[PDB]
From a paper:
Jumonji-C domain-containing protein 5 (JMJD5) is a 2-oxoglutarate (2OG)-dependent oxygenase that plays important roles in development, circadian rhythm, and cancer through unclear mechanisms. We have shown that JMJD5 can catalyze the diastereospecific C3 hydroxylation of specific Arg-residues in synthetic peptides based on the sequences of human regulator of chromosome condensation domain-containing protein 1 (RCCD1; i.e., R141), with which it is reported to interact in cells, and the 40S ribosomal protein S6 (RPS6; i.e., R137) in vitro. Following the observation that the broad-spectrum 2OG oxygenase inhibitor pyridine-2,4-dicarboxylic acid (2,4-PDCA) is a 2OG-competing JMJD5 inhibitor, we report that 5-aminoalkyl-substituted 2,4-PDCA derivatives are potent JMJD5 inhibitors manifesting selectivity for JMJD5 over other human 2OG oxygenases. Crystallographic analyses with five inhibitors imply induced fit binding and reveal that the 2,4-PDCA C5 substituent orients into the JMJD5 substrate-binding pocket.
JMJD5 crystal structures in complex with the C5-substituted 2,4-PDCA derivatives 20a, 20d, 20h, 20i, and 20j were obtained by soaking the 2,4-PDCA derivatives into apo-crystals of N-terminally truncated JMJD535,36 (JMJD5183–416; P212121 space group) in the presence of Mn(II), which replaces the natural cofactor Fe(II). Electron density corresponding to 20a, 20d, 20h, 20i, or 20j was clearly observed at the JMJD5 active site in the respective JMJD5:2,4-PDCA derivative complex structures. Note that in all five structures, the side chain of S318, which is adjacent to the 2,4-PDCA C5 position, was observed in a single conformation in which it is oriented away from the C5 substituents of 20a, 20d, 20h, 20i, and 20j. Thus, the 5-aminoalkyl-substituted 2,4-PDCA derivatives inhibit JMJD5, in part, via competing with 2OG for binding. The phenyl group of the 5-aminobenzyl substituted 2,4-PDCA derivatives 20a, 20i, and 20j adopts a conformation in complex with JMJD5 in which its para C–H is positioned to interact with the indole group of W248 via a σ–π interaction. Similarly, an electron-donating OMe substituent para or ortho to the methylene linker of 20a did not improve the selectivity of JMJD5 versus AspH inhibition (entries ix and x). Crystallographic analysis of the JMJD5:20i complex (see below) suggested that sterically more bulky substituents may be tolerated at the position ortho to the methylene linker.
Author numbering: 181 to 416
Amino acid sequence: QSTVPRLHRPSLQHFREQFLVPGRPVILKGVADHWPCMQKWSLEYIQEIAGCRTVPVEVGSRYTDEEWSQTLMTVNEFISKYIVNEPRDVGYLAQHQLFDQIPELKQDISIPDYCSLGDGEEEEITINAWFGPQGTISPLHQDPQQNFLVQVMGRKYIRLYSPQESGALYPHDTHLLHNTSQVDVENPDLEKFPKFAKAPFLSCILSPGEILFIPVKYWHYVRALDLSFSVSFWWS
Ligand SMILES: COc1ccccc1CNc1cnc(C(=O)O)cc1C(=O)O
Ligand SMILES: [Mn+2]
């Protein structure tokens, strides 16, 4: 097979031994599925609690041959321009510490208990919101910390490549992009990147209530299948 395993509420020792230490991805069930965000966060709730706040928005075109420009707008404007009406471009309220900006929302989540297995402080855990329409796509990339990616709204297709396959992923030569792959995962140029086709991977569709553990430096690729809202915990 090649799917990420799903475990229900495993023990801290079981998670530590079989996944954190060796660096193996896993989906945790029955952990975040009773967080209040799982029943409260609708577009209506998000507009009520956050609608008038300014948020950074990444905007790019469906044509992949562009950069994402970074702008500012109110959550109300974001929802109106990029979620409800057919938009020319895709907009993504991505990698934002919304819960520091709006503590009222921090009541609706928690920090997974498994984070305490790390060697860092809880006051150093980065919490980011990923709120966007169907069709947002990350590059294939790796991050310098452990990650819990919690799906709240919608589904996301995720592809994972171990740091050991890095050679077949053709990272960019620039220093600023050495953590990012040059390959388009879902339509690769196998004439320019032939080693990509035989690089093994894990994949999953992450659904609401589920938590994907992305080991530090594990390459991950993310595409939103629906109107989606995710919360990531970056920790060490
Ligand atoms: C700011 O970055 C952008 C900008 C535009 C499009 C995609 C991305 C990155 N997309 C992710 C990266 N990393 C994670 C993770 O959990 O580490 C999650 C996502 C996710 O889109 O859900
Ligand atoms: Mn990432």
